[PDB]
Amino acid sequence: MAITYSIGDMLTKLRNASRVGHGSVDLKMSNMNKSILNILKEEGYIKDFNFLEKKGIAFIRVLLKYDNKRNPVINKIDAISTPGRKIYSSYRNMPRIKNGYGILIISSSQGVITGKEAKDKKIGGELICSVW
Amino acid sequence: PCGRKRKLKKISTHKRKKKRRKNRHKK
Amino acid sequence: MIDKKQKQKIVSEFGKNESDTGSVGVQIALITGRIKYLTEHLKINKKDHSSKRGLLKLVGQRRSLLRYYQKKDLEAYRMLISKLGLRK
RNA sequence: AGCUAGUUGGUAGGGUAAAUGCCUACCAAGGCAAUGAUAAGUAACCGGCCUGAGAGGGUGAACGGUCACACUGGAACUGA
RNA sequence: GCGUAAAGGGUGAGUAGGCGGAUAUAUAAGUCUAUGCAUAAAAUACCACAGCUCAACUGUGGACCUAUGUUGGAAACUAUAUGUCUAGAGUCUGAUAGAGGAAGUUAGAAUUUCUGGUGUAAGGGUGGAAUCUGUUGAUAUCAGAAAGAAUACCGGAGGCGAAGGCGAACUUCUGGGUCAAGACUGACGCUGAGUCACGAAAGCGUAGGGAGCAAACAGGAUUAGAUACCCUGGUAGUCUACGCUGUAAACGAUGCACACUUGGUGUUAACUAAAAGUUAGUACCGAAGCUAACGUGUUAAGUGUGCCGCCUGGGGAGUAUG
RNA sequence: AAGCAAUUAGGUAGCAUAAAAAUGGUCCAAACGACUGUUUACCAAAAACACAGGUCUCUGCAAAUCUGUAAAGAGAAGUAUA
RNA sequence: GGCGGCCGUAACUAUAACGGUCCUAAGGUAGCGAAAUUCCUUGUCGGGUAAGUUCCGACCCGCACGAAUGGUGUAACGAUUU
């Protein structure tokens, strides 16, 4: 099967649905996927996400958010760390994505947290993805 | 493709094969 | 061919019960039976190459299952190889 | 692309300020190697120097530390 | 970066290796932190402040990295150890399509040769001729016998297989795929350096067979010449059994696998009585996107990653040498 | 003296210790024939002949072939893989 | 069993890839070549030697090599020749 990304699969599905301009997208469900979508939700990139059922398997249905002119909120969403190339960073060397206009998402000792929260709590970890 | 490059390769191959045929049976 | 009767017979022997087809021991035993009658067939029909490819795919499947079983349940693995004759 | 036969390890002994095949006498055939042994070529090493946004690349002048050598090849004495 | 510029291995099965669903607990190797604590001699390198008339130069302090060791913590992720689940992948059951492969039998058309009748001067061939065949009875026509090779029609914007490839008919042996609530195992997976297996045609060894076709070769023509194109002949080879060779424009010039991303028009198989739709393929056009352009476009060359192979100006050169 | 022996260590003696006799000279390159063999008894032992291997051709059995005027015999108490 | 001659021709000189012509059943391909074959000849050059008509490696102007009277090589073998 070599899924190789419970993370990149959802990222790619979300990216594709967002650019074609769908209303909702329907992802596999995991603790990290939930955490990431939660961070998106606070940051105002997605409207909401719900938990569901199909054939006894749980899904996450995410409500894509666009402006009134159908320009997506997500512009570019892309992975940094990667099974063949794992990228870790200290809390000082954390990149500020696009001069802060975007957000960085990392996995740290205290859970999956945004870059600003990682800086404010003085913790660092794996660089999951960058969204702007 | 223009095919001049393929022609170049062809004549090279012919010359090399001719060399080998000439030096066959020699010992 | 391995007829339905010996198929079910080996299932009954090797599984925990009558419905336990999918367990690893049943898997390996069935593939071993297939390998045996195929090596018999290919001993005769030496220029048969599609069959040889099928045999080799079966052998690879058996090795894969054997590694998984030996890693997970070791003593069952040694009992199984000793019973089936698969050398180590 | 195979190499090593004091070569690998063991038991005693020689010797050393001191461990060790460092050396010797016996007992085994072992040891290393496509996760690169062995071989050939090149080269003193480092703190550093030059370059470059950085990562890197090249490099080992002077100065400072270590190592090796003092015509070529050996050997022991004196002595902490 | 690898469709066409140099770059995807001919194809597959797999060892080492790399990577890999959901979830619980423990370990703390990786990672992160107290930029704890030390060690990273001095000078040099960075920032200030000073002394040589300044600068170079020189001196006193202050640090920024990141490198190792160690102390106490955090645990998401990778890793380690023990479990749990089923949606991935398999086994079992049922249904079903197919030139898939191997072995053993059989068939007819057509052609050639041989034998026996009828019958006479041409046949054959080209842009035009000739060589050749024929008065030893040709060609044509009728009947019989023998051998070899290949399978019209079905037959295609098909089908199957990993690829090469596979089409007269039957049996035996045998490989793979697809669909489903239809239960079982519970991540058992992806890719894969060496290695192994297969691999059109040509070629080689041994032993047969040899109708037709046909390198080499011979003759007749075209031409200044014709070691060719054309014509008449013709030996290997083409065929069978076994053992080697392992090369192709072996091409979709596009490696494999998974998760996604508007449609139009046909077509194959299955489910459904059939339409009608779905699923798994297989073709054409085409929106967005992509592309140097050509083009590609749910069978991506689109958006992502896993692993392998390969490229770094042309000639010399896939040569010399090992 | 050790050691089962082969050898090992020490000592002794000589110019010489497989002490006598018996008991390979070796290396490099070329020509011819592959090779072991055979041949001119009595001047030629070779590069000649033979050889396994190869090709052509003959022979359907009262076979080809050979010896004889013949019968007959060999081929063969064999059968084209002969 | 057989497997040819003559003549002319290139940015000197040399040769002749090429062309013409006569004749024949067809005019010697691969490979080899002063050879167990080469008369001229102790051809020419290189190696070996202080000095090499022999020997080895080549050149090709092969009097008069040549493909089962086999051609060119070849590990091993030889009371053979050098």
Curated annotation (Swiss-Prot), chain A:
InterPro entries the UniProt entry points to: Ribosomal_uS8, Ribosomal_uS8_CS, Ribosomal_uS8_sf
Domain of life per record: Bacteria
Gene Ontology annotations of biological process type: translation
Gene Ontology terms: cellular component: ribonucleoprotein complex; ribosome
Keywords: Ribonucleoprotein, Ribosomal protein, RNA-binding, rRNA-binding
GO molecular function: rRNA binding; structural constituent of ribosome
Cysteine pairs bridged by disulfides in the record: none
The UniProt record lists the keyword Ribonucleoprotein: yes
Pfam families the record matches: Ribosomal_S8
Gene3D superfamilies: 3.30.1370.30, 3.30.1490.10
Family statement drawn from the similarity comment of this UniProt entry: Belongs to the universal ribosomal protein uS8 family.
Complex and partners: Part of the 30S ribosomal subunit. Contacts proteins S5 and S12.
HAMAP family: Ribosomal_uS8_B
Function: One of the primary rRNA binding proteins, it binds directly to 16S rRNA central domain where it helps coordinate assembly of the platform of the 30S subunit.
Protein name in the entry: Small ribosomal subunit protein uS8
Organism of provenance: Borreliella burgdorferi (strain ATCC 35210 / DSM 4680 / CIP 102532 / B31) (Borrelia burgdorferi)
Lineage, uppermost ranks: Bacteria, Pseudomonadati, Spirochaetota, Spirochaetia, Spirochaetales
Gene for this chain: rpsH
From Swiss-Prot, chain C:
Sorted UniProt keywords: Ribonucleoprotein, Ribosomal protein, RNA-binding, rRNA-binding
GO biological process, one term: translation
Gene Ontology terms: cellular component: cytosolic small ribosomal subunit
GO MF terms held by the record: rRNA binding; structural constituent of ribosome
Summary of the function given for this chain in its UniProt record: One of the primary rRNA binding proteins, it binds directly to 16S rRNA where it helps nucleate assembly of the platform of the 30S subunit by binding and bridging several RNA helices of the 16S rRNA.
Family in the record: Belongs to the universal ribosomal protein uS15 family.
Self-association and partners: Part of the 30S ribosomal subunit. Forms a bridge to the 50S subunit in the 70S ribosome, contacting the 23S rRNA.
Protein name (record): Small ribosomal subunit protein uS15
Organism, scientific name: Borreliella burgdorferi (strain ATCC 35210 / DSM 4680 / CIP 102532 / B31)
